[PDB]
Each structure stands twice: as C-alpha cells, then as structure tokens.
Amino acid sequence: DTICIGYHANNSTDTVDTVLEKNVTVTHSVNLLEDSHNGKLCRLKGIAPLQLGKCNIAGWLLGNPECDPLLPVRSWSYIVETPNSENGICYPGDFIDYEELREQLSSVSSFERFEIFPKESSWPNHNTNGVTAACSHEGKSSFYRNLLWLTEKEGSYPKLKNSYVNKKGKEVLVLWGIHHPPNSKEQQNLYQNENAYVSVVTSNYNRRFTPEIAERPKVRDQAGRMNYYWTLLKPGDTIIFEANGNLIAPMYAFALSRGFGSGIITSNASMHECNTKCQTPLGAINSSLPYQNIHPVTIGECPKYVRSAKLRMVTGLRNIPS
Amino acid sequence: GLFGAIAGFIEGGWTGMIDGWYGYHHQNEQGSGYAADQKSTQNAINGITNKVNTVIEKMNIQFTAVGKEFNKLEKRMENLNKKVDDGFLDIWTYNAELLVLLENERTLDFHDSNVKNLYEKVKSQLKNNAKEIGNGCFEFYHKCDNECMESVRNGTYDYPKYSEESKLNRE
C-alpha cells in the first residue's frame, strides 16, 4: 500500500520566457499582448468618424470644389485623412498657422457650416464672380466654396467695411484669404489701387495685410500667391473686415463645439457598419488586454503600445507529461 | 526548480490528475486513484489570480494619443516630440518585458514551493509509520483503506492508531 504526492501536467504547448530560462512549456498561461484588428474603420462609442474623402484639412476648410460637399452640420468622434489627399490648397500660397489649426480641430467634436457673409449682397459695388483654373471643377474654372474673390466693379474698388456679430453661442472659426499678384498691372486691373490694404480685427485678434507684388515661379500655372488666414471668434464678439483690395473675403464660417478623446488620423481603411471603444489607423481593436503591438496611434480606450512581439504570462505549472 | 520539487525529486507531472494543480495518487487493496488537494490548489489560484489582476490593473487605460504636424521651420520641435514618444515607448516596452519575465520566474518558483510544502506536510503527518521510497511517494508499514487515505488527504491522520502495526512490520 502506497501513496504519492504529485503535480498537474496536461497537454498544452504554451511556451513562456523567464529570466533564468527561455522558452518553457507550461500547463496554463495568459497572453497580455493584443495583436489582432478587424482592419475596418468603425464608430467610436456610437459616433461615426468625419471622413474628408479626397480632401485634407485645408482642402475641406477652404472648400475645394473637387471634394463632395458635406452636410451643413456634422458630428464626429475622430477625423480621418487619406494618405493620397490630392485635393488641398488648390491656389498656391502659404496657409498661416495651419498646424495649430489642426491641433484646434483635434478637440472639436462638431461643426455647423453657415453663411456668415452672403454673396448677395455683403460686398456692394464689387465683383464676386472671380474664378481661376487652379481651382477647377468639372473642367470649368472655379473657386473655393467658402471664400469669395472680391475684384473691381466698373473700374473702381470702393473701400469696404463689413462686420459679423457672433450670436451662435459657440466659437466661430472664420477663414479668409489675401491675394498677391505678380505685377502691379494685374494689381491695378483687379483692385485699382497699388497701395491696397486689408484690416481684420476682433476683440482679441488684430491683423493688417499688404499686397506684396513680386514675380514668382509658376506653381499650378500661377505666378501669383494667396495666403490663407484664420481666427476663432469668441461667442458674443464681433469680427470686422475693412479693405480696399486684394481681399479674398469669407462667405461660409464654422460654428464649433469642443469635445474630449478626439483626434486626427491618416488611415487607408474603409468605413464599415461596426462599433468599437478603440480605433487605430490599421483598424479597430476589441480587447481588454493591457498591451498592443499594432499601432502607436490610438483613439478611445486602448491598450498601451509596445514594440514587443510576445508578452505571455505563466499561470500554470511547468508541464511535464513524461 | 528553486525548491527542488517540480522537475526535481518528483521528475514528472500527472496527466491523470485533471481536477487540480497539486494532489495525490493512492494505491491500496481497494484500488488505486488520483485525487487533487483542493486547499493548496485554491490558495495558489487566488494568489496567481491576484497577481495577474494586479499586473493588468497597474497599467492604466491608454486614452487618445495622436501625432502632430510641424512646418519646414519647426524641425527642432518635431524632433523633440519624436524624442518624447520614442523615449516613453522604450521605457514601457522595457518595463513590460522585464516585469513579465520576473513574475514568470517567481510564479514557477511559487508552484515548486507549494509542491514541496505539501510533500513536507504529508511527511510530517505520517512520521515513521511509512517510508520514503523516493519520487515523492510513501510506502505504508500497515494497511491503509480509503478511509485512511482520506484521513491523510484532508489532514487528519491518526498516528497512534496504526503505530503498533507499523512498529511490528518495521521490525
């Protein structure tokens, strides 16, 4: 009559690493490293992402005609750009403080595109039919949907001074442009004044612009430039434009609302009818694991990103079926 | 192991014992069979569960973290941002791999320790009424039915009860 004391062995092939010995077969274990994703763009906690399609941030904000127009009011959980955004700034020029604007948009959750300065008529005695070939649409020469090219009417460019009072109850992003002709001849043929100026002022904002005439290398078949500027009009505040030439006036502005846990990503994936608490540019992660080696860029409640290819923790014993 | 039990003087594990991590295998006239020790097993389960949970808990939820953009005249800030991201990444990968390794070692050693502890408990319960035939087994100097085996398993062995018979057979 005999009795023995022994331990559990099963049939698992799970291998873990230790400090003294690598690659040890054990009976039970758990994996703390998530490496799987569905490769889809999903809703985040019930809210669909804002897809810009062919446009990037700049192209959408300015109103590139080549991009399919969005609904007037939109709400999202995160913003998506396509890697090959061919549509952006279609008229050559520098977009000032563009990156800071992106950062501002990273905490924005909703927008309302409204007509701040109606085409007819906020700028009397000026021509608002200005178009260009660089911003073409359906073959024809066109222009930004949100901006307006105020030129000379009947051989004169009268000094305009208009203003908007923000009664939306939210921040109002306002964008405008400043045109820079290559020569003084065009400057006169467009704005009739070689000494033009544009003045934009609010409570906290204050800037003056001057036409800089210079022959510049052809970009998109344009030797002239067009610098783009923006500001955030606080609720109740008033924005004032006052110019006598070279002003690419605003037409549509954006009413913005702030939200948390949002951001911008550059993804190649497509939108599916699905939902997740964690989203990466490669796809959605559905996991409660503490780590993930999929992608550094994460939006929502996600595991921490690491470079590890294996994180397996042992729970059972050293498996010895022999 | 570290305590010399598992893969030590007890060379292999029992595929037969499927109801627990640690246990017994008895052999008497009534027959033979495996039977896990539920107490030690439960303790180990609780400990390791708390360990795992404790490792998952120490890692907070990684909320929204997206990249930023910099123009041609902000290369410095760009490289700084990269320095930050890369640094944090290095540190966390390091911590993860290291912690997992350490906890694995400590886990295996913990199992080993549990097995040795159980063995010593049984040994101290039986005393000189049986002999260590090696390989973590004991041969009785008397007859032991299922009731006796159960008395050994659940920690209620009666030494003076079989003391005489054992002494006689020991000679």
Partner: peptide, 11 residues
C-alpha cells in the same frame, strides 16, 4: 478576471 481552471474553484 478569473482563472477557471477547475470546475470547483471558489472565482
């Protein structure tokens, strides 16, 4: 989380 490794654990 729980390690349900045996059917009689207490988890």
């Amino acid at each position: 989380x729980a390690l349900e490794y045996f059917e009689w654990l207490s988890x």
